Design a protein around this ligand. Sequence first.
Ligand SMILES: O=C(O)[C@@H](CO)OP(=O)(O)O
Ligand SMILES: [Mn+2]
Ligand SMILES: [Mn+2]
Length: 503
Amino acid sequence: KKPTALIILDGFANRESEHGNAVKLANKPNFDRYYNKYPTTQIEASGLDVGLPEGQMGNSEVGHMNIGAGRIVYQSLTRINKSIEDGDFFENDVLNNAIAHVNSHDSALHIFGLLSDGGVHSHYKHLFALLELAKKQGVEKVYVHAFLDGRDVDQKSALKYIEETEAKFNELGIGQFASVSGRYYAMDRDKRWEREEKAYNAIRNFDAPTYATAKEGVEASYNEGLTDEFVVPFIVENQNDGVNDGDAVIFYNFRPDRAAQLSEIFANRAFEGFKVEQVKDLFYATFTKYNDNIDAAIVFEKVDLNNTIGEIAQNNNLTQLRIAETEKYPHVTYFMSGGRNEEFKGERRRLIDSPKVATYDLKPEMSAYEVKDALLEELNKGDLDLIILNFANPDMVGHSGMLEPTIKAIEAVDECLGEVVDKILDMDGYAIITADHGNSDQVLTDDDQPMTTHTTNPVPVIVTKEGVTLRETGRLGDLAPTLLDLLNVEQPEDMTGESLIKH
Ligand SMILES: O=C(O)[C@@H](CO)OP(=O)(O)O
Ligand SMILES: [Mn+2]
Ligand SMILES: [Mn+2]
């Protein structure tokens, strides 16, 4: 059986500067030999090309999702931005029902969310769209419950977002701040119910300090040395009439982990973290589904992904292996399969344990040799059509911000890559060698401090098939179409990426 493999060098991209660039400073004789001999191009793994905002660096979860899907998979922020841009947002059934509940009861609309442009849990421009929709639908009383950031944006920036929102309320003639809470209190994720109870109490006008304005309470916090994240929940005098029977809530956070808890206080009947009398006839809407114990209407429902690469393999009676060490094992399984844990028919998996160290600069080779030897063992069975392999090292070591260890990591990977790819070519197969976003290409700021993040740099592609020419750019959603091309399997319509091999 002739194998085709996708080899993902996690966090390994193309960057012109050599300064702090472990990719260029490493000795990688195997990669270079394949690169110089075989067809090559580079593809985008950041921003709009992988369903993120312009300028946002890629990541492993988003990367491997796009890779397995063979299409652009839009993440929540971009999905919601586009819904607002094209107008579908203003017609959303769930938001209009929430509003119809408030209008018909002559009650109040509350809005909860992280008030910043951090873009990890929320975006405050989504609040402004809610305000415009509420105003378009004639809603009379809108209360905004601000949760302050300081963590996905500068640690003391809350005043700027508050000011711009105040000017929004004025411009639209609608809405007011009713309570203000640091994300420490309103967006805890460790079951610290005592912290949540303070934010709940301020939201519900039950028990909290009061200030005349949102600015005033924030400045007071700052004066006591307490920054945005840790602002103690407070009520805005004369601007909070409680959460009462018949009201609605719209929570605009789209990231589940830190919104779930507050949402259980209000809309999980079974909640017992502390004693509550829950609001009766409360229409509770969440921008995404935060968990299964919240009785909520879901504004943006999860979209299941049909015909990922694994499903197409199954449906052509192919066999496949997913293989990586711990740190990227969910990526080559769950995320690769479009957010699905169940194995496809014909799918087998190999998990290799990562070393247990706090940071991987302490063992740059990680478990890459064990991964390679597991893969050799699988290939020697001769029964694999498709292999999806990830070498974790360049990402996981590069996160250390240390250049020599990150070089050593790439070098170990290069030794493994040689053994793997030579075996595949030995078996008359094909490898696509590539990455899911950058990181290791830059481990030092330009002034020589540690840099510990992913990059927005494009990623290399090597396809080990002779006499062929690759397209000059593309995106991660083109990799799976390239695998099907190599396997001579038909590509279905809902895979909208395009093979990198020119025809
Ligand atoms: O703590 C969180 O909520 C985010 C930062 O907003 O960090 P991470 O994605 O690492 O959990
Ligand atoms: Mn990655
Ligand atoms: Mn990473």
